[PDB]
Amino acid sequence: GDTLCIGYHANNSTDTVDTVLEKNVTVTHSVNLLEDKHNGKLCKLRGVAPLHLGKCNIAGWILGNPECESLSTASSWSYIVETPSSDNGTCYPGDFIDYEELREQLSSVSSFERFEIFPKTSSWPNHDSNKGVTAACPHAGAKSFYKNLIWLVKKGNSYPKLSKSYINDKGKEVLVLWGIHHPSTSADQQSLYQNADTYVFVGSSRYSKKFKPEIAIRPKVRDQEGRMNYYWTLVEPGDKITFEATGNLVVPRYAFAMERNAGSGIIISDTPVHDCNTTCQTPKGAINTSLPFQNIHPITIGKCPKYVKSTKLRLATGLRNIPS
Amino acid sequence: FIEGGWTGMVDGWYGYHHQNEQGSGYAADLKSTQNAIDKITNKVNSVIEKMNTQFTAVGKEFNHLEKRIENLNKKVDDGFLDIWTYNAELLVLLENERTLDYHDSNVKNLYEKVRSQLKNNAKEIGNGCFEFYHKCDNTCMESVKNGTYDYPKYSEEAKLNRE
Amino acid sequence: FIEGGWTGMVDGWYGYHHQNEQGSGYAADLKSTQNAIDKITNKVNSVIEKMNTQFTAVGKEFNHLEKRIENLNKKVDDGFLDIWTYNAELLVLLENERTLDYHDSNVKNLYEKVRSQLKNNAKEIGNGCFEFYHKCDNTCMESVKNGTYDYPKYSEEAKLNRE
């Protein structure tokens, strides 16, 4: 009398899966479909390091704030890291028109070189480019201004009609940022440009706008009684941009020749940047996985798994775990 | 039916418990185990691999005068979150049912293979076991494991033992 | 197999019909009915409770100069509508098919338990019925029904009345 039996494998595992008809089913083997681990670093997407700005935001870096000269400008980046406590940008108060649009275009650049579009010593012999400093933008305790801009003041007692043009012939889009100062009092306008009624004109093939400065008193922000609107315009290669003003033109000296990429974002996080490579990015730290779902953060940049509200997504692989 | 699993079985998912005059223990069926492992590995790889996500950035930035488009983007993200959460939990639950039912069916067709092979030469005593009427040594009992059992060699001995 | 259901059962989804000298009637199998009721209730509650929505406002307002953003919002709403309608319809039909197959599996499992318990002591006459070769009393009926049938006690009587 011999006995042959049929049975199945059991482990000491306590991995419980959830099924439709039954919850909390202990199985022999399970495979997690949910990723809940991150490295706690801000890595490089597609092998290109991000652009960390530190205490500066995008406006302070792209306008040349005096607190942002220590930052390095790389040839290319994949995304932009901004500290949540960063407050260094637009030291002189006013509105940055289409700020978020420019932040979207500057999210990923494959080739970013900075050049002097208009040299300070060889473009304006008729205008004063040295007294354009203010207490809104201090540098080592002294008065300074934006690095990428020049606040042109009258040369003695005369601010004549201004006319400058830049020819783009380097095969890349050139981004040009300028500003229009709005003095609080007409005495400030007489002290700065001496013409009580001025205008600013910036024109291109696609861009054409005539700016009139507005002379009225405002609430005092950073000890400034008047505002300053900052504008921007991409310039196609083989095209030119003209600057024309009786006054109130804060004219670029450095412009940026960029070739842009698509599909990037800006991360607001305190997570430090480390030398690492991931295909997925997250403000809490990068994700390196192949599972289709994750529950770390909704805002992800890269080829990232779909964010779910789940806490446990385990797929059963082996049999039921019934030891007896 | 079969009450519990075998913690002494490590060579495979599916197998046997031989016992005769000269031995007892366990001997896992390698073919059915390897087929089930390949099938459920393809199941997990098919769930994982069919998700192809393009290069994208979820977050968008809006100022104080784009509250409607900000709420539109938040509504888009929350609807995607609800769709993906419901589909993920329901896919996990239905696929876990189908995996466990696949395991129970593998148990039952292994039982059916040995039952259809043995015929009247053994006795069904419950919990997947067969008590042999004849003398079936380890060559015999190993030959039952794969599908090379000679019924008429032991049929007369089982007929004499049954009555 | 089993052609039709029985209206006379009230307390159970599954059960037995015994007919002997002392009478007849319908007795429900409480274990399988309670297991099926718990599993089906957990299945339904798994369908509802995975809908983890948040607070939201679906409707957006626009002026006449934001027709493109309005059409984007309508495209978002129609895509969410199509996804949820297709997923809900296919989910309901697939789970209805799985529920009917589960009930058929419970019927076949009860039949397999009874058929493996009785063995050769009864005839398989069809329509889910076993006629006993021996005089199976009422105590014999619920000895079958709680899983403690005495096969060799009635084996001699079943062999006598078989031929």
Epitope: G1, D2, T3, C5, G7, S324 | I2, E3, T7, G8, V10, H17, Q19, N20, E21, Q22, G23, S24, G25, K123, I125, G126, N127, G128, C129, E131, F132 | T148, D150, P152
Partner: antibody, heavy 122, light 108 residues
């Protein structure tokens, strides 16, 4: 509770035939497998034989193979053991014990009996 | 057969302390190992089965360990009724069931 009362022990010459019995009560005899365990004087416990719950397959130890025959009566709720041509090493105290599981999980001994002494002497 | 060698052959300990009892195996029995007790004149008693599960009516002071070759039985508190001769049980590869030679646990 479970009760296992043994009987049939005594003094027998070598080469004769002896039979023991083990009366069971308080539980269903026909669903639990049955055993016999002996302990020789000056030795340890030695397993003797096993019968199933329906009494179909039978195993004996290597020393007592061929000479021994286990049997049971499920109607009378009584286990048995038969010897032919006993040995001087066969003299021991014999315990009947209950297997708490089935031919899937044969093995250990949940309940025991008082036991009877077999004295094989001339 | 899977022979079962018990070491040491005699454990002499005072009541109230820890006791250990080993039973080596020639073949790995996975976890299917049990232990037994034997008073002089009384019936044997099943304390632990499958090397981790204690039986009903057994005090919690008895506990076993081991998986495969080496198996040990540990008594947390030696009371006055714990003295006797102890045996180890294999059930993995049995056409014969093989016991250990025994460990006589006494009063010193």
């Amino acid at each position: 509770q479970v009760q296992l009362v043994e009987s049939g022990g005594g003094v027998v010459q070598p080469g004769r035939s002896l039979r023991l019995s083990c009366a069971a009560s308080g539980f269903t005899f026909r669903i639990y497998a049955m055993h016999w365990v002996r302990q020789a004087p000056g030795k340890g416990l030695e397993w003797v034989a096993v019968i199933s719950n329906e009494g179909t397959n039978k195993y004996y130890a290597d020393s007592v193979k061929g000479r021994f025959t286990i049997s049971r009566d499920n109607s009378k709720n009584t286990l048995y053991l038969q010897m032919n041509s006993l040995r001087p090493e066969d003299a021991a105290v014999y315990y009947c014990a209950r297997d708490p599981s089935n031919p899937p999980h044969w093995g250990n001994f949940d309940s025991w009996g008082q036991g009877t002494l077999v004295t094989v002497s001339s | 057969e899977i022979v079962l060698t018990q070491s040491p052959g005699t454990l002499s300990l005072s009541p109230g302390e820890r006791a250990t009892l080993s039973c080596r195996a020639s073949e790995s029995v996975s976890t299917y190992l049990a232990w037994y007790q034997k008073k002089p004149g009384q019936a044997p008693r099943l304390l632990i089965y499958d090397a981790s599960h204690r039986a009903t009516g057994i005090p919690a002071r008895f506990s076993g360990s081991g998986s495969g070759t080496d198996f040990t039985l540990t008594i947390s508190s030696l009371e006055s009724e714990d003295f006797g001769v102890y045996y180890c049980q294999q059930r993995s590869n049995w056409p014969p069931i093989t016991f250990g030679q025994g460990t006589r646990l006494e009063i010193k």
